[PDB]
Design a protein around this ligand. Structure first.
Ligand SMILES: *[C@@H]1O[C@H](CO)[C@@H](O)[C@H](O)[C@H]1NC(C)=O
Ligand SMILES: [Ca+2]
Ligand SMILES: [Ca+2]
Lengths: 83, 196, 82
């Protein structure tokens, strides 16, 4: 809690969970990042930008590649199609 | 060839350039029309966003964000707002005349807004298949306006506009069962005649 | 009572997931709620209700001592009966 409560005030902290030996729970493929953008570029997404000027929010998210596709992190190569 | 015209007749209906009325109740933000389509520079990115507008009512106040010349001018709630002025101000123009907000943006682009819901963008002879979105491609062919963002024609428009939402994680709309009577006129044959 | 799927956007309330965590946004009504995986309610609320609200999360004023004003309105020292 203390992490977020400071973060809300306008001053965020970084990497504190690295040595704390406690990470908040998240499903497979993701673990807790800090200050990920809400507009997670997913798999079946339109490539538009500079509308998501929202503030930055903490939470768990995929690795660098491994785009989101239906609640899991899957590699960008295997983005399916839909019909 | 003349100057075509999108439209939003009512809350959830859409008329294409080539002319194709179709039904699409949405609640997310959607790409009405743009230029960034396939193999193009992508000058303008007119968007539209409705809220509480799957069922038409006194709700469904629209929001419109139009993205041209690296600017951010948008409108809703009666007035227009400049969030980011664009570079070439010379082409910019606003004509608040009568009931409308006539709004030019260039040589071959113009927007009209009834202050309430309607969005009637007007494009010139310039493009001729250089755009895509919910209004189709502006090619003259009238039965290829449902070419989804994944580059295939779809038969069912409710799946189409789902392909054109911006936030790719919001709620896509629901395939409604087809009938001649909306919710109120459903099994309300009396009212159904008076409305008729 | 009817279990619905997710996401869900009726009546101006977008019920979405963000960063693997569930969100409920009421921006028209000026709030954002969410939950994490472990279960930790959080409410981001707009300054429009400055000095107005009163509930279990206290009033949105500046002070942090007076925000036990009961459903009648009574500054109660106890954080429990409140
Ligand atoms: C809160 O409202 C009360 C009653 O109207 C008023 O007396 C008081 O000055 C207000 N305080 C703040 C911090 O706005
Ligand atoms: Ca066409
Ligand atoms: Ca307080």
């Amino acid at each position: 809690e203390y992490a977020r409560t400071c973060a809300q005030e306008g001053m965020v902290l970084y990497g504190w969970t690295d040595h704390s030996a406690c990470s908040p729970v998240c499903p497979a493929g993701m673990e807790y990042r800090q200050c990920v953008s809400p507009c997670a570029r997913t798999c079946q997404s339109l490539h538009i930008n500079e509308m998501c000027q929202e503030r930055c929010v903490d939470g768990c998210s995929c690795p660098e590649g491994q785009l989101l596709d239906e609640g899991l992190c899957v590699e960008s190569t295997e983005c399916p199609c839909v019909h | 060839v003349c100057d075509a015209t999108c439209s939003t007749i009512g809350m959830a209906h859409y008329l294409t350039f080539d002319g194709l009325k179709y039904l699409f109740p949405g609640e997310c933000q959607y790409v009405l029309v743009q230029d960034y389509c396939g193999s193009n520079p992508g000058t303008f990115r007119i968007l539209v966003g409705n809220k509480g507008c799957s069922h038409p009512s006194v709700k469904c106040k629209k929001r419109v964000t139009i993205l041209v010349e690296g600017g951010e001018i948008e409108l809703f709630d009666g007035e227009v707002n400049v969030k980011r002025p664009m570079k070439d101000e010379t082409h910019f123009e606003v004509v608040e005349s009568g009931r409308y907000i006539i709004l030019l943006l260039g040589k071959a682009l113009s927007v009209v807004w009834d202050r309430h819901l309607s969005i009637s963008v007007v494009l010139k002879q310039t493009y001729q298949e250089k755009v895509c979105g919910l209004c189709g491609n502006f090619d003259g062919i009238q039965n290829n306006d449902l070419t989804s963002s994944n580059l295939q024609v779809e038969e069912d428009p409710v799946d189409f506009g789902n392909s054109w939402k911006v936030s790719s994680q919001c709620a896509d709309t629901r395939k409604v069962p087809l009938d001649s009577s909306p919710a109120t006129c459903h099994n309300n044959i009396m009212k159904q005649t008076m409305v008729d | 009572d009817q279990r619905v799927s997710m996401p869900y956007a009726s009546k101006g309330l977008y019920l979405e997931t963000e960063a693997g965590y569930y969100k409920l946004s009421g921006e028209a009504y000026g709030f954002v709620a969410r939950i994490d995986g472990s279960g930790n309610f959080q409410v981001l609320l707009s300054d429009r209700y400055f000095n107005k609200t009163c509930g279990l999360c206290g009033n949105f004023n500046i002070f942090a001592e007076d925000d036990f004003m009961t459903q009648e309105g009574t500054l109660t020292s106890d954080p429990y009966d409140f």
